[PDB]
Design an enzyme around this catalytic site. Structure first.
Site, short mmCIF file in Angstrom:
data_model
loop_
_atom_site.label_atom_id
_atom_site.label_comp_id
_atom_site.label_asym_id
_atom_site.label_seq_id
_atom_site.Cartn_x
_atom_site.Cartn_y
_atom_site.Cartn_z
N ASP A 187 0.82 -1.22 0.00
CA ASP A 187 0.00 0.00 0.00
C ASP A 187 0.85 1.27 0.00
OD1 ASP A 187 -2.22 -1.64 -0.03
OD2 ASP A 187 -2.47 -1.59 2.14
N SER A 188 1.62 1.44 -1.08
CA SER A 188 2.45 2.62 -1.25
C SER A 188 2.57 2.90 -2.74
CB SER A 188 3.84 2.44 -0.63
OG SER A 188 4.68 3.52 -0.98
#
Ligand SMILES: [Mg+2]
Ligand SMILES: [Zn+2]
Ligand SMILES: [Zn+2]
Ligand SMILES: [Zn+2]
Lengths: 66, 446, 115, 59, 50, 463, 28, 47, 59, 32, 258, 54, 49
Positions: free
Chosen positions: F154-155
């Site tokens: 989640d980046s």
């Protein structure tokens, strides 16, 4: 608020085309035709004339003096 | 003096559920202002790199620094006593990348091999003999991955897509599907690596490495695995899009046929119940057995649609690759995306009649049909009907409420459990007692 | 607030060397060339040019960390051909090739205009 | 002894936030209740209350 | 489908069945043990035990 | 009725006319239970298997059920409900032009974005929500892939060149309030530069930065722990003046001075701050795909399509299957189609004429893959990527959760007065709390020395 | 005359009229 | 000799306001007024 | 600003896009959240089980 | 105005081309 | 054990972009040349703006930001000026910088459109792209506002900031027919043919080629307006050659010192 | 006082000296939101006065 | 007192910042920023070594 100077992705100058884009859209041309009439091939530079919101007008409505 | 590179700190995340939530780390300053940590160490902390927060304390005594370095450290805290299995495992894109890297049909040239070897902190400095000398020197993914495995490890594991009817029949030691992982002298020989062999599971390759080799050896193993697999992902590349979600235009026909059959079956069941033929199943009333039969029919239809969708995928599909690798997803996710979502149950039952004998004003009274009680017939790719959209929202709200109450109750449960056995320990007399010196067990764990 | 400036990607700092040679101990005739304030531009071409030379047994670079401006190039040649002269020859022939390419491009341009 | 939070500061961070705040509701039930029936989205909230917009914390 | 080592389960069971009676993990079962006033106030019932 | 209404504005025709004519009707929640509602007028009435054939009413449009934050979500039904709710909650935190007359307001904690573009795909509902006039995001060429590895859990990876050109570059204001009052018969406040001689209580900061009136002039450089107002209260005088909060480092926009209801000198000052998008800043799209920028690469390092089009954001592919956000992919595909064509598209939740096959067919008529995938090149070596990456325009937002506003540290800072322990709060320069769970974890590790140090040595030593 | 098929465009004219006559915060 | 000039709120007319004086414009008479830009070397880097 | 043209609004340092409907107390935008409760003058017959009564006719 | 006329022409064109509609990614409920 | 003999052929020469082809060269050299085209290309641009009176509605820094992105022609000036960092004087000397000025104040009733044309440069050849097509709109002023400032331009390259990025978008592509299998199409029939594809319309992709090196790299360098395309290519080649020469000199010094 | 960096990588920036010493001196950069520690000799006072006053 | 300032206190030399992935660092490393590192200190004893 104001049209950027260059396209974020590509880098081509798009600041000097907002007025021309408005004029072409006003005369008879549509958007899909005006974009390639101005010289915008890549789809990344076409968002600058379609997604851009012209909020500087509302700001100018609050004239300081007179 | 200010904090310099090499110092020992204690990086921690705010909810400390278990022991593997406060381990020491070595310092390394970087220009930008954001904490960083290896992705493998993300599983213990349960962090997600989505705006999280993690504290960082600093001792002020050589005594405490040495104590933390010797007791609370990442390499030393790889295996947990709760389930005697590794906690830090490859559960990110590196997992899928390495899975595709260890397939039988992986060939690399001298340039790529020599480029990947540079990202190896334990390379002996000798280029391995290529698996295919002529007509051109070509290496294989497994051969390169062997150098990443330290020491002489020996373990056997099974791949996710391993057919059960293979060991009994012939081709046991030579699998057509490249399964049945076999490692000898720390060299990969067969099988494709997945979570079963690299993830957090008993007997995994990392578990065997830690048990045999030292903690620092396992640390170097993790580092080399990540530094090689991520770099090769550049040449490989992974993605996801619409092209990975479309069926073959025949699977849609099969799914529609199955859904129509299920609808006909449930309508027939409703007709039988109306005309008083469905006899009550033992142990349940008439309504209970009617609901159970409807639910079983719907679940069978959903499973059939999911199986049909799964069998209609291609090896190049990305959803299937990520599911078989186990990095992130599952088969049910693919089933819901392509085939059909399913039933939107609430409180362990179907959608109730909020209004007078009907779910919503659209449906008519006494409409126990599937679509009128939550059964979502469409899929996330082909859009959803407003009614099933609302029912799906209800299900999501149920899940959110469950999570909120769990997040409030489990904390108190854990607090009470910890405040009742906070003084128990194993004395030097090799026996477990408490603060009152009362023997609880003559030997720990009997 | 701690964002580094933009000149620290190419400009050398007082005391930092542009290039440092370090001999390896695991195998004979193997040295690691560490370059400061550079990126893949100045290492990939050298890697390929070294790959062209048959006397080079091993050649490949890396980036220890993307935020850090540094690259390590490891070279290993035959025992009768030191890696220093290999690196020098790679740079020399690459420069000659680039100059020739520039000359050809220039003459092609000057001929294209009205011709 | 009276209620709390009846009059809140209007969050002027973006026009969408202002619109949402000016048309927001709040139930008088006690905060963080053990029960789970009032929080669940009821079938009668069709076209009256957004079934998706809602917080995700204790409320 | 989860797994927990049996040693922890056994340790919990013995601690709850050490004084013969089923001592409750709540404030009403642990504070009754003769541990000490400073240990009972930590869990719950601070001023009462003090 | 439709003809008479389409010519509204010009003459005088409005909704009241429809209500009076007897075409629409207000049904409340208590009466809605006794009416056979219908979804669409045409589909649910033609002639088929006799379901009810007794419809009394009919809804206007199904998508009208959505609220405010949910309406701006394109294709909400193509996504799972939790992610729709997450987007609806995160929408309120999106920055941008929150009001046209922002330069006149003096509110506290105001954010404004430089170039708030409009979504390339706009739902028919946001036309009345006024979102297009005051958007809160920029359309970025997002390529879902795992380029390097800094965008895995989640980046994202933003383009340094794009940020340099003003990609999601916003501003941060911070207004202040402070006025003089008659404390007591002898006590009295007044704006005046606290000199080094008469004023006893004084800070170890610079004071000549402001003018003699005691108010810092606009467009002056300020930093943390700097005097902003020259207030001095007579006991000779005490420097009872406020200072800029630590780790702000802004510039003064304008200074306003007036009288309050009591009649004392009341003044307000706001300090702006050009927040260049850096790693750690939280971003989010219109489907719940939150994330924080891990690393930023220059254009030369980012990948590129067959032409010079480098992705501006690169999310994790693995975030799609688990979260089931096919709506995001549909939005990206439709945005690519719109950009190629040159006009904003429709993303109405329920339209019965927007599927994936037709969009794909349209996209195939411009030299692009019908599914939107394209062939990229490795930005480092220049070798084609084996997997055909999925790149296309997509509308992303930026939240106010900056990293500079959350970063904090401490080294024997100020202490409280009741219990001699560190303060609490980033603004007050306090330390983090070593919760009981951390104590339990340390006991589990058996590190008694570290525990006693944290609880006594670096907490509140006393003899 | 009834409006068969050609109803997607006339479906939103009523919504436009409603939002023009009554604002979003009209209830307050 | 700087009398701390100000700018009126709506009139945008310069005014000379000194200490211990009411905050009002020379004409009409309002209660809002802003300051003038500093005279320092305001130098930015077009980055 | 009751039915005032956008010209004056712009001249009065305001915008016509502001939804309005929010009080201004001490220079702070205050908004009243719409509270919900049980409808009055309606008979409710619940069936509370954790009590001595089988049914309760609240009104 | 051009968008309004564009929508009207699109609607009339969609009404005209009513030959066949055989598409995979679309469905609708059909109770009873 | 030496280099190769690359060949060049221009297919389209215009004053906005050039499409050339490089044959008989390694992929690494081509990619490096591309990244140099984008990043390491000396060019003049605005980097130091002194604002004295800005009564516009936008921020004080907004003016500087927009001015930084305005291209400046440097056909024969970039090679003469020196980097401000390596200057041996004080203040922005004209020998190592170019001065600009802007003084516009809306006096009439109609609103002004402050364009790049208002940037009065001291040097004749260092001017915004307005020689030979509207001008870059900076800001809009109204009766009562003004914008007075003066800025200086310096030499820099894209690696430092995007303002020094002359190339708009480089279309780098090699091996149009998927012959080297560097990318595997799950369904080749569903993909279109590349602009440089020589393959007929029947076959989807060329057959496999085991013994085949990448050649015939296509380029479409597109100039933003400041530097000419061929000039950009020549500058990039010269800069890469200089970097290699400096690296060689440093290596020779290091070897001699040991 | 306001100074100006005349030599070094930051040549051209404008800032106010925050903390000065015998050798080095901290100067806060006006444009960027960061404070650097540049040598004192690299600085050049420019000042900001107001001639006239009548 | 007990749960407020005896079992859970506030300690110095602490920090709290957002986190981002960084595979280039080993599992035992941590990418701290420069500001927090310069703000904190470690009491070290002097020794001729
Ligand atoms: Mg998280
Ligand atoms: Zn573009
Ligand atoms: Zn007045
Ligand atoms: Zn000079």
């Amino acid at each position: 608020m104001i049209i950027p100077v260059r396209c974020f992705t590509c880098g081509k100058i798009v600041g000097n085309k907002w007025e021309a884009y408005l004029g072409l859209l006003q005369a008879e041309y549509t958007e899909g035709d005006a974009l390639d009439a101005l010289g915008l091939k890549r789809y990344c530079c076409r968002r600058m004339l379609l997604a851009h919101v012209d909020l500087i007008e509302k700001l100018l409505n609050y004239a300081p003096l007179e | 003096r200010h904090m310099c590179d090499g110092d020992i700190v204690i990086f921690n995340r705010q909810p400390t559920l278990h022991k593997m939530s406060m381990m020491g780390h070595r310092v390394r300053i970087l220009p930008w202002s954001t904490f960083r940590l290896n992705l493998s160490v993300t599983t213990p902390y349960n962090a997600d790199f989505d705006g999280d927060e993690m504290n960082l304390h600093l001792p002020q005594s050589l005594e405490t620094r040495a104590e933390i370095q010797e007791l609370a450290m990442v390499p030393r805290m790889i295996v947990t006593p709760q389930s005697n299995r590794p906690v830090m495992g490859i559960v990110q894109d590196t997992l899928t990348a390495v899975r595709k890297f260890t397939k039988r049909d992986v060939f690399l040239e001298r340039g790529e091999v020599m480029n990947l070897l540079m990202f190896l902190s334990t390379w002996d400095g000798k280029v391995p003999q290529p698996a295919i000398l002529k007509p051109r020197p070509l290496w294989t993914g497994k051969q390169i991955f062997s150098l990443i495995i330290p020491g002489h490890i020996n373990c056997i594991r099974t791949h996710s897509t391993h057919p059960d009817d293979e060991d009994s029949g012939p081709y046991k030691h030579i699998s057509p599907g490249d399964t049945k992982v076999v490692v000898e002298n720390g060299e990969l020989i067969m099988g494709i690596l997945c979570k079963k062999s690299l993830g957090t599971s008993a007997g995994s390759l990392v578990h065997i490495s830690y048990l045999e080799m030292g903690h620092d050896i396992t640390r170097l193993f993790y580092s080399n695995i990540q530094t090689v697999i991520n770099n090769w992902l550049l040449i490989e590349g992974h993605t996801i899009g619409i092209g990975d979600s479309i069926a073959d235009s025949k699977t849609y026909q099969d799914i529609q046929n199955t859904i129509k059959k299920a609808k006909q079956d449930v309508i027939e069941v409703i007709e039988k119940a109306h005309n008083n033929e469905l006899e009550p199943t033992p142990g349940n009333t008439l309504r209970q057995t009617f609901e159970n039969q409807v639910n079983r029919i719907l679940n069978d239809a959903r499973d059939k649609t999911g199986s049909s969708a799964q069998k209609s995928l291609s090896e190049y599909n990305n959803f299937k690759s990520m599911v078989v690798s186990g990095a992130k997803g599952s088969k049910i996710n693919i089933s819901q995306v392509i085939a059909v979502v399913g039933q939107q149950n609430v409180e362990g039952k179907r959608i109730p009649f909020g209004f007078k004998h009907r779910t919503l004003p659209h449906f008519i009274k006494d409409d126990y049909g599937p679509e009128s009680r939550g059964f979502v017939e469409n899929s996330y790719l082909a859009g959803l009907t407003p009614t099933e959209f609302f029912f799906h929202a209800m299900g999501g709200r149920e899940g959110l409420i469950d999570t909120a109450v769990k997040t409030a109750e489990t904390g108190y449960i854990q607090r009470r459990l910890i405040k009742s056995m906070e003084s128990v320990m194993v004395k030097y007399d090799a026996t477990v007692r408490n603060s009152i010196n009362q023997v609880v067990q003559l030997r720990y764990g009997e | 607030m701690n964002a580094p400036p933009a000149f620290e990607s190419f400009l050398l700092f007082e005391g930092e060397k542009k290039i440092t040679i370090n001999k390896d101990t695991k195998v004979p005739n193997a040295c690691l060339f560490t370059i400061n304030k550079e990126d893949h531009t100045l290492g990939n071409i050298i890697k390929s040019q070294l790959l062209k030379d048959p006397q080079v047994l091993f050649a490949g670079y890396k980036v220890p960390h993307p935020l850090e401006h540094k690259i390590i190039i490891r070279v290993q040649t035959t025992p009768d051909y030191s890696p220093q002269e290999a690196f020098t020859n790679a740079i020399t022939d690459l420069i000659s090739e680039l100059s020739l390419l520039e000359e050809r491009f220039r003459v092609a341009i000057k001929d294209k205009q009205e011709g | 002894q009276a209620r709390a939070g009846v009059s809140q500061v209007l969050n002027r961070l973006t026009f969408a936030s202002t619109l949402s705040h000016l048309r927001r509701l709040n139930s008088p039930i006690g905060r963080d209740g053990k029960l789970a029936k009032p929080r669940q989205l009821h079938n009668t909230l069709w076209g009256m209350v957004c079934p998706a917009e809602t917080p995700e914390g204790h409320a | 489908g989860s797994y927990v080592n049996y040693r922890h389960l056994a340790l919990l069971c013995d601690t709850m069945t050490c004084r013969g009676h089923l001592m409750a993990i709540t404030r009403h079962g642990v504070n009754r043990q003769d541990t000490g006033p400073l240990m009972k106030c930590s869990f719950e019932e601070t001023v009462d035990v003090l | 009725h439709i003809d008479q209404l389409k010519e509204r504005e010009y003459n005088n025709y409005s909704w009241q006319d429809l209500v009076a004519s007897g075409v629409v009707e207000y049904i409340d929640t208590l009466e809605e239970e006794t009416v056979m509602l219908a979804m669409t007028p045409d589909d649910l009435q033609e002639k088929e298997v006799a379901y009810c054939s007794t419809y009394t009413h009919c809804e206007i449009h199904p998508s009208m059920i959505l609220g405010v934050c949910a309406s701006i979500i394109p294709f909400p039904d193509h996504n799972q409900s939790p992610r729709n709710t997450y987007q609806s909650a995160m929408g309120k935190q999106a920055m941008g032009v929150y009001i046209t007359n922002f330069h006149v307001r003096m509110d506290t904690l105001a954010h404004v974005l430089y170039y708030p573009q409009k979504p390339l795909v706009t739902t028919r509902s946001m036309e009345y929500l006024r979102f297009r006039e005051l958007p809160a995001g920029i359309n970025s060429i997002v390529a879902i892939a795992s380029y390097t590895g800094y965008n895995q859990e989640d980046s994202v990876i933003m383009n340094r060149s794009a940020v340099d050109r003003g990609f999601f570059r916003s501003v941060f204001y911070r207004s202040y309030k402070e006025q003089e009052s008659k404390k007591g018969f002898d006590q009295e406040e007044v704006f005046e530069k606290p000199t080094r001689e008469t004023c006893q209580g004084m800070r170890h900061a610079i004071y000549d930065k402001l003018d003699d009136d005691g108010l810092i002039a606009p467009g002056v450089r300020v930093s943390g722990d700097d005097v902003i107002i020259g207030k001095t209260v007579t006991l000779t005088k005490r420097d009872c003046s406020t200072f800029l909060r630590t780790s702000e480092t802004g510039i003064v926009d304008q200074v306003m001075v007036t009288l309050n209801q009591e009649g004392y000198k009341f003044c307000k000052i706001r300090v702006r701050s050009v927040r260049i998008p850096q790693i750690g800043d939280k971003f989010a799209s219109r489907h719940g795909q939150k994330g924080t920028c891990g690393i930023q690469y220059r254009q030369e390092d980012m990948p590129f399509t067959c032409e010079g089009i480098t992705p501006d954001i690169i999310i994790n592919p693995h975030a799609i299957p688990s979260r089931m956000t096919i709506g995001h992919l549909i939005e990206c595909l439709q945005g690519k189609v719109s950009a190629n064509k040159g006009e904003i598209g429709d993303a109405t939740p329920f339209n019965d004429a927007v599927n994936v096959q037709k969009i794909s067919n349209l996209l195939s008529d411009y030299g692009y893959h019908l599914r939107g995938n394209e062939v990229l090149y490795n930005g480092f070596t220049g070798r084609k990527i084996t997997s055909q990456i999925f790149i296309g325009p997509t509308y992303y937002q930026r939240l106010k959760h900056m990293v500079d506003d959350k970063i904090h540290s401490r080294a024997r800072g100020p202490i409280q007065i009741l219990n001699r322990q560190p303060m609490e709060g980033r603004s007050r320069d306090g330390g983090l709390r070593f919760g009981e769970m951390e104590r339990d974890c340390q006991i589990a590790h058996g590190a008694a020395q570290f525990l006693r140090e944290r609880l006594f040595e670096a907490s509140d030593p006393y003899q | 005359e009834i409006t068969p098929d050609l109803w997607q465009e006339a479906c939103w004219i009523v919504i436009s009229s409603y939002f023009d006559e009554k604002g979003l915060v009209r209830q307050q | 000799q700087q009398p701390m000039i100000y700018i009126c709120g709506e009139c945008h007319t310069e005014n000379e306001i000194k200490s211990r004086d009411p905050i009002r414009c020379r004409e009409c008479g309002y209660r809002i007024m802003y300051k003038k830009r500093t005279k320092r070397l305001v130098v930015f880097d077009a980055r | 600003l009751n039915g005032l043209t956008d010209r004056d609004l712009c001249e009065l340092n305001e915008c016509p896009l502001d939804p309005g409907g929010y009080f201004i107390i001490n220079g702070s935008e205050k908004v009243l959240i719409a509270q919900e409760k049980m409808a009055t003058n309606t008979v409710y017959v619940f069936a509370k089980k954790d009590s001595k009564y089988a049914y309760t006719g609240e009104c | 105005e051009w968008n309004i006329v564009e929508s009207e022409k699109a609607l009339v064109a969609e009404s005209h081309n009513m030959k066949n509609q055989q598409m995979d990614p679309f469905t609708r409920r059909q109770c009873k | 054990p030496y280099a190769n003999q690359p060949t060049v052929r221009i297919t389209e020469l215009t004053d906005e972009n050039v499409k050339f082809i490089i044959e008989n060269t390694d992929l690494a050299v081509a990619n490096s040349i591309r990244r140099v085209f984008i990043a390491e290309v000396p060019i003049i641009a605005i980097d130091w703006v002194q604002i004295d009176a800005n009564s516009s509605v936008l921020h004080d820094e907004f003016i500087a930001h927009r001015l930084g992105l305005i291209p400046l022609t440097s056909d024969d000036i970039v090679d003469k000026l020196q980097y401000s960092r390596d200057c041996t004087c004080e203040e922005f000397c004209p020998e190592c910088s170019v001065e600009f000025t802007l003084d516009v104040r809306c006096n009439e009733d109609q609103t002004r459109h402050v364009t790049s044309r208002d940037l009065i440069s001291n040097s004749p050849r260092v001017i915004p792209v307005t020689s030979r097509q509207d001008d870059i709109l900076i800001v809009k002023l109204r009766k009562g506002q003004e914008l007075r400032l003066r800025a200086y331009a310096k030499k820099g390259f894209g690696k430092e900031h995007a303002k020094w990025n002359p190339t708009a978008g480089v279309a780098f592509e090699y091996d149009p027919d998927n012959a080297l299998r560097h990318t595997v199409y799950p369904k080749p029939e569903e993909w279109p043919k590349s602009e440089y594809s020589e393959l007929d319309e029947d076959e989807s992709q060329a057959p496999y080629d085991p013994n085949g090196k990448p050649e015939r790299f296509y380029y479409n360098v597109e100039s933003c307006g400041s530097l000419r395309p061929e000039t950009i290519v020549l500058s990039a080649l010269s800069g890469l050659k200089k970097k290699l020469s400096d690296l060689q000199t440093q290596l020779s010094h290091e070897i001699q010192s040991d | 006082q306001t100074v100006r960096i005349s030599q070094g990588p930051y040549k051209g920036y404008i800032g106010v000296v925050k903390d000065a010493t015998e050798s080095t001196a901290r100067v806060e950069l006006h444009s960027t939101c960061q404070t650097i520690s540049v040598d004192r000799q690299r600085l050049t006072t420019v000042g900001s006065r107001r001639p006239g006053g009548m | 007192r007990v749960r407020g300032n005896l079992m859970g206190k506030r300690v110095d030399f602490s920090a709290r910042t957002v986190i981002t992935p960084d595979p280039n660092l080993s599992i035992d490393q941590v990418g701290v920023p420069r500001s927090i590192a310069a703000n904190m200190t470690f009491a070290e004893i002097v020794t001729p070594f």
